[PDB]
């Protein structure tokens, strides 16, 4: 009531990652988003200089599904999370989603998706982040198979130091 539920399906799948900016986020549960397909891309044609590859987004697609994690956060983080997801610059738009745990319990969450972008593969580093998250929080083993099968781009240049070590370990 005083806190809000955030459903993420990308880099914020990894606890260590979401904790960088949101160290008070609390794992709430794993859930599925039906009729939504995952994808990666360049917002407004721009290539993320943080990840050096497409960034995660979703769109409505019958049959497809997206698995993520519901994180409980304080409502005081609202604006912080929005600005964190580049809403002001048109990068991402705020969305309300209705997902459900593997037990069949539906949950209403806040999430994000780009409305103007061009598909682009993720950097090998961005991919490792999500995979490390999917494994960690125990998303369905099969869904992880889809994430692990993602073809990354050819980037091996320097990357975020505080992200390098997360990946190293």
Swiss-Prot record:
InterPro entries: G-Glutamylcylcotransferase (IPR017939), GGCT-like (IPR013024), GGCT-like_sf (IPR036568)
Active-site residues, record numbering mapped to chain: 85 (proton acceptor)
Superkingdom of this protein's organism: Eukaryota
Enzyme class of the recorded protein, top EC level: lyase
MF terms (GO), sorted A to Z: gamma-glutamylcyclotransferase activity; protein homodimerization activity
CDD domains on file: GGCT_like
Induction annotation: By geranylgeraniol.
Binding site for substrate: 6-11, 126
Keywords: Lyase, Phosphoprotein
Residues with the Phosphoserine modification: 160
Gene Ontology cellular component annotations, sorted alphabetically: cytosol; extracellular exosome
Catalytic activity: an alpha-(gamma-L-glutamyl)-L-amino acid = 5-oxo-L-proline + an L-alpha-amino acid
Effect ascribed to mutating residue 112 to F: Little or no change in reaction kinetics
GO biological process: release of cytochrome c from mitochondria
EC number: 4.3.2.9
Quaternary structure, from the entry: Homodimer.
Family to which the UniProt record says this protein belongs: Belongs to the gamma-glutamylcyclotransferase family.
Functional summary from the UniProt entry: Catalyzes the formation of 5-oxoproline from gamma-glutamyl dipeptides and may play a significant role in glutathione homeostasis. Induces release of cytochrome c from mitochondria with resultant induction of apoptosis.
Protein name: Gamma-glutamylcyclotransferase
Gene for this chain: GGCT
